[PDB]
Design a protein around this nucleic acid. Structure first.
Ligand SMILES: [Mg+2]
Ligand SMILES: [Zn+2]
Ligand SMILES: [Zn+2]
Ligand SMILES: [Zn+2]
Lengths: 171, 180, 276, 550, 97, 112, 87
DNA sequence: AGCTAGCTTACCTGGTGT
RNA sequence: CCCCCCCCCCCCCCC
DNA sequence: AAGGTAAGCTAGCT
């Protein structure tokens, strides 16, 4: 996972921008929209590649308004999480319910019940931790999580993860 | 919803049912993440999955070259790696893109292989395996000691590779690992 | 009904006349590829008259002392008499004018000469005669090769269909057949020299203008030629007083006959046979 | 209409016609529709959870759609449904339903003629879906038995089983909205139930129905029989709600309540101690209203009259042309930016001009965008206002909200910004479309140049009279004002009066010199006609383009 | 005033396509609908404010388009659906000529 | 010969009332009535029964009965007729619409 | 299938610009100029968008291309610069 | 009682405004 | 749903 | 105080 996908946005440009710095404005409008965005379909569109070689093609002029529509062909780095993907990450939050791990652009939440039964919460620590006879999971620790499922919300993807199984947990 | 991005995959989605299936490590990723992809030239091209180390370098490269283009139009190591990257982002990105800043810090902090030289050698090694781009990316991103660790965390590998061949590869990777 | 049946007919970028299915109705609009507004009734000279009258008008025989071009007509006059290589060109010219006359008498069986065609040639010559202040007294600076080849070459530039292939190229020839019959009859050597007293400068200007005008005359792709035709038949039918007076056969006419035709009426009022 | 939507704007490239599966109708539906009642939820003037906005759209200027929460000029309205107690034929398909029956075995649901019969093979071969169906029908109709066995392609001595049952086929005839068969001392006559036809139609193979006119995705033969009825939203059946304590319900709203009422009586009857041949009474009634709602002008039958003895408009009725949706509202519409008055002639007008009464220029506007070229002209026009002739009526901001220059407290202090629009009055030399109905000519509609003039008539040059076919014995003419720089160009560059001089209809001019001018031209150009110096000088000065050379 | 059928014909004969469109849209009817990209119906629940789209019974909140059509056509389409006929509108070509 | 006769007759009616309509207009009509197998009338049964767009054919004479058959037989309107774009409030492929207009970034920069 | 784009060499449409092209070009450009678009010609005191467009067309400084569709769907592209404006 | 002849029957019939 | 209003051009002969 | 036609279908011709 973390992919390089060929994608293409359609952008309508107003006649005031029909100057020589046109292709410039188009490429910036592309990055304004596309970069930093997040769809369920392709995932997180993190960074657009080969800025110098983005394909503008010809722009068809839209009938009653002046503006012209271009289909900007481009290629970018994407992050799509999946069920069963084993991910390495950092603990960001910690409660009676569990802990959230940051994996690149997204967060994966680990349920109290999706951890070994030996691991138990301790609110009486600064900051709150999950204590075991061996390890202590807290607000800065590195964890290997197995994604159990995803949910696509607005402009992000969140997932639930387990550390119950073998070879998973604190690293 | 919004004026979102299209793809090079052409759908025949006419009235017909939301027949959609699961996404796993049965290597059933989307139709969007099928092995047999089609580039902007129309040619069939194989899926590009990136191990953290690669992805780190791709983004860096892209961003550096972008800064160069922005300087043309203007006319007419470990912790320092993070320090520096956050300065390149200041210059090439919109700042509002919190996703990329978050990714860069993650990639910078979780990459196994620093320099391009080593990443090329990792690519060369896993190249020959004949495994799926996803399994190849996971082998580069996840640090495993035993073939059991690998085959457990990457279930799809199951009968695809010998236990010792996988264990041979795993040694080459731990040897190729940068000393931060 | 006429409008609703023709709405969708239009001239495409291949000069073909098609409907909303892209089915071919006409291979070129109006069998000639010309816009109706750029057409004027013109007389095809070659068609009519005595055979001897035609001969006197067009025949140039440099090998005959009484049938050459008089040296008062052109500068080359004296040196042209008895030239075998030029008579070859002039025999070539005359044989075509005869061929054309035969062809025309096949199309217009009754010998009607006045037909609406593009490019009013009479007016071009008139304007040339005016522009240049032609003096029907002084010998022309034209050569036999200048007239004969000038016309030959102009014909190559009278383009209705562009396209590299024998289908379209034949199609192009077919489309210009009639205009050329007119063009050749009106720009023959004896006429150009004896009738209009054209100079090289003047003859060049006539040729350049026939070309420019000919291309302006061609239909424009996008022409909603279907509605045009419906409205063109439709509106004159509304100004029909009829039926067939209040009285050679008492045949049904006007609106009821047009009605008969469009409906493709099986039992028609006045069935009749004309036996020759 | 109005308000920004992030959705991608596209055009319709294709229209896929088809039929609604009952499953679709229910899946599309926002409300179940249970009560014949419109509202008064125990007298309370507000829509009921039963009919019209049980979530369908607003009756009031409420801004509550409940579904989209959008409000009137935005909400398209959402369909609901009615689950019918018994199946019913769709009036429109009665004959097709009949014909399909005549092609299929009314028992095993097989096609009566196999690809075994030679004439049938020819029919199957037919590429055109419609034509193919007519060939299969004329062949199958007459086949009154479902053969078990048929003579093989090889030797007819050795018959091969093609499949299907043995069963006799009924001779079907239509009686009202029912279909009655006749099998074979003395024939058996019995009505074919809707449920019965449907069960057979559900059993017709995909290969079989696609061999007939049908389509596996978009229109399965089973869908011609209504099971689940879609309820159109208020925008289709407007409640013309005059006052608080007064109704105003649409014809369709009542017909639907009749349908509903018929359906409840049936469901109650059939659930309770159903006296089986009292059920067929309420069932025939449900069929009648579902039929009479789509088409009321049914061939040889009693029209569904209203309380008033007024036939009740079917949906079919609204689409039947010349003033009727398709020809009435779609091929032609009444339009804004249009004017009409009596026409009169003017020798002092240029061929291509049109005299426009000040009144009409002061009403008709052109939306001109504020640009550095006209920023000054437009501010004066705004300052002049809506009542002075060269003036304007509205200013339209970047925001989209309109400033009415006759009521704004800031009407005398508008500082225009590039990009705004000034809806200025129609001015001299603007291109406008002028027309005289019946427009039977391309020349019956031509682009003229404005000339703002006193008096209430449109004024035109007499030589333009001929193509319009207009006299001045009280003729009226229409004027249409283009609103785009793009459409103004269209008028001036394609349909300007001078452009129309020589007509392609007869390859000659369609305008010439007429009447007084034609009469006096003969008179002026006679041999005895001589003009003295005095007159000569004025005759010369009258010609505008004159060289100044006597 | 009526820009009737006959007047539509003269405009066609002239070749004034934009003028014809302006007469029938901006100067009269013109309305904006949200079409589903799958079932092609006017089913979309545009809560255009929260930027929410959705065609339930397609479970589609992604493949949605906006189209500019004469309100009378929107009416026509609802009237055909009212009689069990599906006039599905698509923004791409399936066939090809 | 049917076409030839058909023109001859159509012409003779226009000619009778004195008037003259250019050859091409009558030719075009006579050709439309002919291009199929035989004589296709300018009627409800004639041309309107052609394989054209459901939406365009319904705009003349049989409206509802047409749209009903369109539904039953799952017809697909290609949207290339004038009538369809008129119903759709779209620019028809008529004259001014018979082509498309594009900005070329290349020339834009070249002119500045 | 972008095999519909007909190459520059082997382009059989007219080298001359149709009345409809001219009308749409002028209209388009005038509308664009009207909505504060950059102008490619020195306006010699001009202030009307149509008159500015006619000037742009006369000096062949209109950065537009006509896409001429053929019955099958194929098409030829013609630069306003290259098309002959006789008419 | 195969086919066909004479019925019968829906479909449309210019444009605009008290 | 009526109704009206509009349209009702041209032209019989003689070379 | 319709008219012409294209379906369809009864009655009454083998
Ligand atoms: Mg009058
Ligand atoms: Zn709503
Ligand atoms: Zn059977
Ligand atoms: Zn849908």
């Amino acid at each position: 996972m973390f992919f390089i996908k060929d994608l293409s946005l359609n952008i309508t440009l107003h006649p005031s921008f029909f100057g020589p710095r046109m292709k410039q404005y188009l490429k910036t409008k592309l990055l304004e929209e596309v970069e930093g965005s997040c769809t369920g379909k392709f995932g997180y569109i993190l960074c657009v590649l080969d800025y110098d070689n983005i394909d503008i093609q010809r722009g068809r002029i839209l009938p009653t308004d002046g503006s012209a529509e271009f289909n900007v062909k481009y290629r970018a780095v994407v992050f799509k999480p999946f069920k069963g993907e084993v991910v390495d990450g950092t603990v960001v939050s910690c409660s009676q319910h569990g802990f959230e791990v940051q994996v690149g652009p997204m967060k994966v939440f680990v349920t109290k019940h999706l951890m070994p039964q030996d691991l138990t919460f301790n609110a009486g620590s600064n900051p709150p931790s999950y204590q075991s006879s061996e390890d202590v999971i807290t607000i800065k620790s590195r964890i290997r999580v197995k994604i159990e499922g995803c949910i696509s919300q607005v402009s992000s993807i969140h997932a639930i993860g387990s550390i119950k199984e073998d070879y998973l947990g604190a690293i | 919803m919004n004026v979102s991005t299209s793809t090079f995959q052409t759908r025949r989605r006419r009235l017909k049912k939301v027949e959609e299936e699961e996404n796993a490590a049965t290597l059933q990723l989307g139709q969007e993440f099928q092995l047999k992809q089609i580039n902007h030239q129309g040619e069939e091209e194989e899926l590009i999955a990136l191990n953290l180390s690669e992805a780190r370098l791709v983004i860096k490269e892209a961003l550096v070259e972008r800064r160069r283009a922005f300087k043309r139009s203007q006319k007419k190591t470990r912790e320092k790696e993070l320090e520096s990257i956050d300065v390149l982002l200041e210059q090439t990105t919109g700042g509002n893109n919190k996703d990329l800043k978050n990714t860069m810090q993650y990639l910078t902090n979780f990459s196994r292989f620093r320099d391009q030289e080593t990443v090329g050698a990792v690519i060369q090694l896993l190249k020959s395996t004949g495994l799926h781009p996803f399994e190849v990316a996971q082998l580069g991103s996840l640090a495993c000691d035993t073939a059991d660790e690998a085959k457990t965390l990457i279930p799809s590998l199951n009968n695809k590779i010998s236990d010792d061949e996988l264990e041979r590869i795993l040694k080459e990777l731990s040897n190729l690992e940068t000393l931060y | 009904r006429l409008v609703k049946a023709l709405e969708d007919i239009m001239v495409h970028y291949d000069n073909t006349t098609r409907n909303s299915l892209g089915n071919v109705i006409q291979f070129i609009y109006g069998e000639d590829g010309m816009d109706a507004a750029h057409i004027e009734k013109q007389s095809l000279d070659t068609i009519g008259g005595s055979d001897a009258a035609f001969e006197k008008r067009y025949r140039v025989d440099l090998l005959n002392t009484d049938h050459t071009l008089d040296p008062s007509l052109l500068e080359s006059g004296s040196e042209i008499l008895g030239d075998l290589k030029l008579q070859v060109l002039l025999d070539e010219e005359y044989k075509q004018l005869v061929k054309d006359r035969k062809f025309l008498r096949e199309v217009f069986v009754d010998g009607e000469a006045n037909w609406p065609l593009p490019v009013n040639i009479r007016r071009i010559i008139q304007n040339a005669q005016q522009t240049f202040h032609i003096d029907h007294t002084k010998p022309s600076d034209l050569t036999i090769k200048d007239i004969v080849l000038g016309v030959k070459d102009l014909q190559e530039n009278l383009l209705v269909l562009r396209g590299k292939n024998e289908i379209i190229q034949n199609a192009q020839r077919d489309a210009v057949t009639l205009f050329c019959c007119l063009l050749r009859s009106r720009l023959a050597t004896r006429r150009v020299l004896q009738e209009y007293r054209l100079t090289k400068q003047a003859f060049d200007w006539v040729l350049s203008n026939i070309e420019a005008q000919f291309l302006r005359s061609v239909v424009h792709p996008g022409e909603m030629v279907g509605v045009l035709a419906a409205q063109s038949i439709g509106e004159p039918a509304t100004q029909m007083t009829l039926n067939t007076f209040h009285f050679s056969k008492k045949v049904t006419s006007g609106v009821p006959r047009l009605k008969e035709i469009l409906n493709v009426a099986k039992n028609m009022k006045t069935p009749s046979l004309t036996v020759y | 209409g109005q308000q920004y939507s992030s959705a991608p704007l596209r055009t319709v490239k294709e229209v896929q016609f088809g039929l609604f599966s009952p499953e679709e109708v229910r899946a599309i539906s926002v409300a179940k529709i249970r009560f014949p009642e419109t509202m008064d939820e125990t007298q309370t003037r507000a829509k009921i959870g039963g009919l019209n906005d049980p979530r369908l759209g607003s009756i009031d200027r409420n801004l509550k759609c409940q579904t989209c929460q959008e409000g009137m000029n935005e909400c398209p309205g959402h369909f609901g449904h009615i689950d019918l107690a018994k199946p019913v034929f769709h009036v429109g398909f009665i004959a097709k339903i009949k014909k399909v029956c005549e092609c299929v075995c009314m028992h095993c649901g097989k096609l009566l003629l196999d690809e075994h019969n030679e004439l049938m093979r020819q029919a199957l071969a037919i590429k055109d879906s419609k034509k193919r169906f007519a060939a299969i029908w004329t062949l199958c109709k007459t086949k009154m038995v479902c053969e078990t066995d048929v003579p093989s392609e090889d030797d007819p001595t050795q018959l091969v089983s093609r499949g299907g049952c043995g069963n006799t086929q009924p001779t079907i005839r239509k009686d009202g909205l029912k279909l009655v068969g006749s099998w074979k001392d003395e024939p058996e006559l019995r009505v074919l139930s809707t449920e019965e036809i449907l069960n057979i139609f559900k059993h017709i193979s995909v290969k079989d129905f696609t061999s007939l006119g049908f389509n596996e995705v978009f229109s399965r033969p089973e869908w011609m029989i209504l099971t689940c009825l879609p309820v159109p939203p208020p925008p289709v059946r407007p409640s013309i709600s005059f006052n608080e304590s007064q109704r105003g319900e649409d014809d369709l709203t009542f017909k639907l309540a009749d349908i509903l009422k018929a359906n409840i009586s049936l469901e109650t009857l059939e659930h309770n101690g159903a006296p089986h041949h009292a059920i067929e009474e309420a069932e025939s009634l449900l069929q009648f209203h579902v039929a009479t709602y789509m088409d009321n002008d049914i061939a040889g039958q009693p029209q569904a009259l209203q309380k008033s003895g007024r036939p009740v408009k079917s949906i079919r009725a609204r689409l039947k042309g010349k003033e009727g949706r398709i020809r009435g509202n779609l091929m032609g519409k009444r339009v804004d930016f249009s004017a009409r008055t009596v026409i009169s002639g003017d020798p002092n007008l240029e061929l291509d001009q049109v005299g426009v009464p000040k009144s009409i220029a002061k009403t008709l506007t052109y939306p001109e965008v504020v640009t550095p070229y006209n920023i000054d002209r437009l501010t004066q026009l705004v300052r002049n206002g809506p009542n002075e002739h060269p003036g304007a009526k509205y200013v339209i901001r970047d925001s989209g909200d309109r400033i009415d220059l006759r009521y704004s407290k800031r009407a005398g202090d508008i500082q225009l910004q590039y990009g705004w629009k000034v809806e200025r009055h129609i001015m001299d030399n603007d291109p406008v479309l002028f027309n005289r109905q019946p427009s039977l000519h391309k020349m019956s509609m031509m682009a003229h140049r404005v000339k703002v003039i006193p008096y209430s008539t449109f004024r035109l040059n007499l030589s333009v009279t001929s193509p319009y076919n207009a006299d001045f014995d009280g003729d009226e003419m229409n004027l249409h004002v283009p609103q785009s720089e793009e459409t103004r160009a269209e008028l001036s560059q394609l349909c300007a009066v001078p452009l129309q001089i020589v007509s392609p209809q007869s390859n000659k001019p369609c305008m010439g010199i007429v009447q007084d001018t034609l009469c006096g031209i003969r008179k002026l150009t006679l041999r005895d006609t001589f003009i003295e110096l005095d007159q000569v000088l004025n005759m010369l000065y009258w010609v505008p383009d004159w060289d100044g050379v006597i | 005033l009526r820009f009737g059928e006959m007047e539509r014909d003269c405009m066609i004969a002239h070749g004034a396509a934009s003028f014809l469109k302006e007469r029938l849209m901006e100067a009269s009817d013109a309305f904006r609908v949200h079409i589903c990209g799958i079932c092609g119906l006017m089913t979309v629940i545009a809560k255009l404010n929260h930027n929410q789209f959705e065609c339930k019974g397609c479970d589609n909140k992604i493949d949605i388009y906006q189209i500019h059509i004469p309100y009378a056509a929107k009416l026509l389409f609802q009237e055909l659906m009212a009689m069990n006929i599906t006039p599905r509108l698509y923004t791409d070509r399936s066939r090809d000529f | 010969a049917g076409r030839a006769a058909l023109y001859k007759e159509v012409y003779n009616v226009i000619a009778s009332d004195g008037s003259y309509v250019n050859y091409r207009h009558m030719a075009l009509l006579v050709d439309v009535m002919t291009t199929q197998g035989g004589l296709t009338s300018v009627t409800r049964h004639g041309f309107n029964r052609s394989n054209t767009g459901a939406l365009m054919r319904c705009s003349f004479e049989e409206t509802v009965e047409i749209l009903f058959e369109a539904g039953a037989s799952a017809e697909l309107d290609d949207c290339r007729g004038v009538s369809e774009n008129v119903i759709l409030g779209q620019m028809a492929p008529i004259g001014t619409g018979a082509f498309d207009v594009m900005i070329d970034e290349e020339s834009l920069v070249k002119y500045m | 299938l972008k095999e519909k784009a007909i190459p520059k060499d082997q382009r059989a449409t007219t080298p001359y610009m149709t009345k409809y092209e001219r009308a749409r070009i002028l209209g388009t450009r005038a509308l664009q100029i009207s909505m504060n678009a950059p102008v490619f010609v020195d306006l010699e005191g001009e202030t009307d968008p149509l008159r500015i467009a006619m000037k742009e067309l006369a000096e062949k400084k209109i950065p537009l291309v006509i896409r001429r569709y053929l019955p099958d769907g194929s098409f030829e592209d013609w630069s306003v610069e290259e098309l002959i404006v006789d008419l």
